[PDB]
Ligand SMILES: OC[C@H]1O[C@H](O[C@H]2O[C@H](CO)[C@@H](O)[C@H](O)[C@H]2O)[C@H](O)[C@@H](O)[C@@H]1O
Ligand SMILES: OC[C@H]1O[C@H](O[C@H]2O[C@H](CO)[C@@H](O)[C@H](O)[C@H]2O)[C@H](O)[C@@H](O)[C@@H]1O
Ligand SMILES: O=c1cc(-c2ccc(O)c(O)c2)oc2cc(O)cc(O)c12
Ligand SMILES: O=c1cc(-c2ccc(O)c(O)c2)oc2cc(O)cc(O)c12
């Protein structure tokens with residue numbers, strides 16, 4: 161009944177891209193269709209990796225197979241890490257088509273560009289993707305989940321405070337999407353030093369017809385490791401819970417963040433047991449414990465409340 | 470914990486191959502790794518389909534990545550439909566090496582060759598695949614799920630009766646596999662014309678060699694479903710894993726799971742198509758996602774009899 165077209169990476173071993181997004185959305189009842197934009201043995205954080213990349217002509221072929229069977233009717237599109245400009249442009253063309261087929265289609269975009277490590281911001285994708293994201297992808301997106309670095313790149317503005325972040329989210333709203341969620345490890349938290357800040361803003365038209373905006377903030381005590389695939393799972397769960405709670409960004413974000421916390425907590429406890437006391441766990445040991453978190457995906461216990469902005 | 474390497478087709482829309490096998494095994498708690506041997510828009514029962522095939526060099530490249538990371542430690546391998554002889558030969562090489570890494574690895578093989586339509590056999594794969602299955606795949610496999618037609622092709626004999634099928638299953642056992650399930654047949658059922666027979670045979674140690682043989686008579690729901698054999702092999706893997714000494718219960722849970730999925734699928738297909746209208750392939754896609762709770766704990770709706 162609720163159809164999602166997810167165009168993301170596939171790995172054999174582990175949970176990133178479509179492997180992070182598909183099982184949880186299926187567990188939540190979505191008819192999610194996975195276009196695998198790469199097929200790799202494992203993610204590129206390992207010592208070794210091999211695989212094959214889907215090119216934009218092949219992506220167009222697969223969409224053509226859907227169109228010919230009148231199977232190009234989706235409720236959502238979901239994208240994330242995209243490596244190639246020609247590929248991103250074909251994704252744009254497909255989303256435009258799908259939005260003409262279904263004007264109510266919701267495009268959820270994780271605009272993966274890069275991140276910051278201890279002051280150095282640096283990108284993960286070719287720099288020539290940024291104009292495509294600015295002029296073609298973000299204007300088409302309805303929900304975007306930039307981290308702070310990508311929100312800065314997309315807006316052209318450095319963020320030094322919650323104030324400036326909220327201004328950047330307004331800037332992002334004006335570029336296209338009605339829902340903007342920024343994640344940041346660099347904004348300060350009154351709760352401590354290992355906290356992640358989530359800022360969410362959603363504009364909607366209420367039953368009376370007025371355009372209003374709900375703004376929220378979460379201060380999350382991180383679990384004591386860094387993982388691969390976290391942003392992919394975040395965007396997938398944000399899709400799921402905004403779908404279930406379309407007019408309640410606070411609840412949507414609380415369920416999203418609580419799902420991630422349960423998965424990551426379980427993952428770090430399993431990784432440390434495999435690694436041993438004091439031993440730094442490997443990337444293999446840090447793979448998200450996705451199938452073991454089924455019950456937390458289905459009904460996450462809320463472990464952090466958002467504050468109203 | 471329990472890791473499965475599944476080398477099968479991927480489709481964007483629908484449930485065949487790895488799309489039929491992965492979600493249910495994930496729901497049941499297996500760490501299933503999906504090697505997509507093709508990526509097509511949909512299965513070939515539709516009017517159109519587009520996509521790309523994984524070749525044997527690309528399969529080897531993928532496995533090398535796993536091996537370089539010391540990630541080639543699996544508890545199960547699972548395969549089904551393969552069109553390409555060199556690809557199937559690569560799979561055998563990989564399974565051989567995974568068995569060297571883990572001697573207790575269980576290879577579950579659906580030896581997809583063809584099927585009978587009105588008693589008439591017709592084939593799904595090129596002829597040169599049959600020698601590969603007979604001489605390389607089946608000898609390596611530990612659990613196989615041929616239909617009757619495939620059992621006849623692999624063994625070289627016709628099956629006209631239960632007794633003949635069980636003798637053919639014994640020949641398959643002697644070729645390698647300790648578990649053989651003939652998943653559909655033309656055999657008659659006392660329950661009526663609208664039933665098919667499923668027969669299972671498992672060789673195991675109690676520490677003597679003992680045999681368990683079972684039979685089930687299953688009311689065949691009337692529709693052409695795709696991916697049924699893929700789901701059957703995946704759930705046989707799952708339930709023989711949970712019940713290693715009880716083929717009867719493993720088969721009851723497998724068939725019951727299929728029943729719940731297919732029953733839900735035909736109820737939905739008939740509602741979308743309307744009274745009288747034969748449903749389309751798109752309306753008949755397995756309602757996999759909506760069957761999550763039946764997969765988790767299938768209500769037993771069929772009893773197997775121990776032979
Ligand atoms: O829409 C189909 C089913 O969706 C719901 O159930 C799923 O989503 C829930 C959260 O919204 C999960 O808790 C649950 O585990 C999923 O199965 C709905 O509750 C079901 O009745 C529908 O069948
Ligand atoms: O081994 C991991 C889990 O496996 C079981 O749970 C799964 O399998 C059950 C059937 O064997 C399903 O009923 C259940 O929904 C699955 O989650 C086992 O019962 C659990 O304890 C394990 O965590
Ligand atoms: O909810 C959480 C959301 C995120 C997150 C979200 C988006 C990203 O692009 C990212 O890199 C991390 O990270 C977490 C890290 C945590 O340790 C705990 C958490 O709850 C979260
Ligand atoms: O358990 C069932 C198993 C299957 C089946 C299994 C393997 C195949 O290669 C195949 O072509 C069909 O077929 C069924 C058809 C049914 O209508 C109901 C069922 O329960 C089954």
Ligand code: NA
Nearest residue numbers: 305306307391
């Ligand atoms: Na993100």
Ligand code: NA
Nearest residue numbers: 614616652698
């Ligand atoms: Na079969």
